[PDB]
Write a protein that binds this ligand. Structure first.
Ligand code: ZGI
Ligand code: ZGI
Lengths: 301, 302
């Protein structure tokens, strides 16, 4: 038993990080088969970052302007092209450590592991969720652009995030591996703001089930409710509305604990209207929304 | 910016994990050079686990009673010996993915990463601290014994923890890689209890500095206290006393923020006496004590 913010093992991804330099600008790249993927703002000088015309900046580069280092080994760039906000560098050597992989675009509310890298070197791993406002609450310093987010299913690494930038509230924005941003953001240093965030209700319910599995039961009550009555109080507190698809996904957790989803919902409603009163759930004094139902099953079953 | 519970990248350890089976009993082992280390209770049956005489149980085994699997490959056991609560299995092949490593015994308050494994296969990675009562608040299911805890310093993996068992309060206990338990525990199924846990004061102050670095400043004030005055109120709240050694370790954080340690102690004193009053610090509504000063610098400076 117990419950932790658990990331996927990072070994398969660690062997794919390289360092990419163009001029005096350096960041991380992802090396798969014979292609290196990285954020396109590697081709920009500090001056260009204010309002770059990336097409112009790229036509003024040649293959030799890109230094790609995999540890000590230099990789020779033989082609380049830009796809949306990523650059793809064709290199002369295919990565012998390329894992089975795919590129996925995730939805708000889902979680993934981030391998934070600097100078092409893995520094740390942590778990986060895609927020409803398409930011992530990450931990990134200068030089972290190009770090990736991923999940592992069976033997296959699913890449879902490449890091680009930080917003002025301390949250982070990036793209999928096709170069398309999550959210209404652009990779230029102009005024932008994330929309208001909301709490991921289905995740909160999944975490309450993890609590019951682990013996924290003080918040349960003998009541039940309906979706419509629950969704009405949820919106009053900036919670995502619950749908029948959500109820179905919580099925296995309902089954293992014998507590129906709508009874769990009555407990949540009561916690929303009256707070915790200095009590904790799984060591937290706030309601946690960055564990999905699948995360709970994986860790508790 | 930002601040997360960050683990070390686990790749160097993943290649050392193997599955060890003796009879119907299977758990994880750690394969370094030509030695596999694993918890000695793999030699037990559901029956032996209440009052095992491990010396008796081990003399009744031979090398071929041990099946060691490294993925698709069988490793052949050519010798075995017990070192305290670990078993050391000599095998015929040296692990080609052996990293530069050392074995370290850590102190309470220090943190490390855990690679949770099942059937020799890595399942997840997370960070925890060794509590003052020598337990860890981990996440472990049946079959997780032999999972390891580690830190990475430059190129070198420092192994500090092998998982063995769960206590009835839902916390976890294990050994260093020399087989010596952390705490007063033994690997038999008899009544044992963890001592009372205390909060790691030096880590709470380190986390308060992380907050200031990230722009959370609401709890600060102009007051100052003395070490003895601070330590007076610390005891009342089950906090570890603070020593000048701790004050010294917080030096680089104090310098980078311009807030003296004794100033921040005065802020902590106030938070203990009045609570947060529905405010949060770095997204938590409780005082967090599982980040060391070193963890904060690594994550907030580089
Ligand atoms: C637009 C809006 C006002 C909302 N925000 C910003 O202007 N934020 C800016 C931003 O993040 N930028 C600026 C520049 C990069 C992107 C950027 O510096 N990435 C960072 C990761 C950042 C840093 C803090 N933690 C992170 O996540 C990064 O890794 C890099 N830096 C540079 C700079 C020069 C050369 C190469 C690189 S590689 C972009 C092309 C967008 C900062 C935080 C620097 C002010
Ligand atoms: C002594 C005290 C009363 C304070 N507590 C316990 O009796 N706790 C017991 C305990 O943990 N034991 C029993 C047995 C193992 C050790 C043990 O089962 N390890 C677990 C890891 C556990 C499980 C839950 N999460 C973990 O961490 C484990 O991986 C293994 N299981 C077995 C069983 C049979 C054969 C091989 C193995 S490999 C020991 C030799 C001590 C439990 C939780 C099973 C009741």
């Amino acid at each position: 038993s117990g419950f932790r913010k658990m990331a996927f093992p990072s070994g398969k991804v660690e062997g794919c990080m390289v360092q990419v330099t163009c001029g005096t600008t350096t960041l991380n790249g992802l090396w798969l088969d014979d292609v290196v993927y990285c954020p396109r703002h590697v081709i920009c000088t500090s001056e260009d970052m204010l309002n770059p015309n990336y097409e112009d900046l790229l036509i003024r580069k040649s293959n030799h302007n890109f230094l790609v280092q995999a540890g000590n080994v230099q990789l020779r760039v033989i082609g380049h092209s830009m796809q949306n906000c990523v650059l793809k560098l064709k290199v002369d050597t295919a990565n012998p450590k390329t894992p089975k992989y795919k590129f996925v675009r995730i939805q708000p509310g889902q979680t993934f592991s981030v391998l934070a890298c600097y100078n092409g070197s893995p520094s740390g791993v942590y778990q986060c969720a895609m927020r409803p406002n398409f930011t992530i609450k990450g931990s990134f310093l200068n030089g972290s652009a190009g770090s990736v987010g991923f999940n592992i299913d069976y033997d296959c690494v699913s890449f879902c995030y490449m890091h680009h930038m930080e917003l002025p509230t301390g949250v982070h924005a990036g793209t999928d591996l096709e170069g398309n941003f999550y959210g209404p953001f652009v990779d230029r240093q102009t005024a932008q703001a994330a929309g208001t965030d909301t709490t991921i209700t289905v995740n909160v319910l999944a975490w309450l089930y993890a609590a019951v599995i682990n013996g924290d039961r003080w918040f349960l009550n003998r009541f039940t409710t309906t979706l419509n009555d629950f969704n009405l109080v949820a919106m009053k507190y900036n919670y995502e509305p619950l749908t029948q698809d959500h109820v179905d996904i919580l099925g296995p957790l309902s089954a293992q604990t014998g507590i129906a989803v709508l009874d769990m919902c009555a407990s949540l409603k009561e916690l929303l209207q009256n707070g915790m009163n200095g009590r904790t759930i799984l060591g937290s004094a706030l309601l946690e929304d960055e564990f999905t139902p699948f995360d709970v099953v994986r860790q508790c079953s």
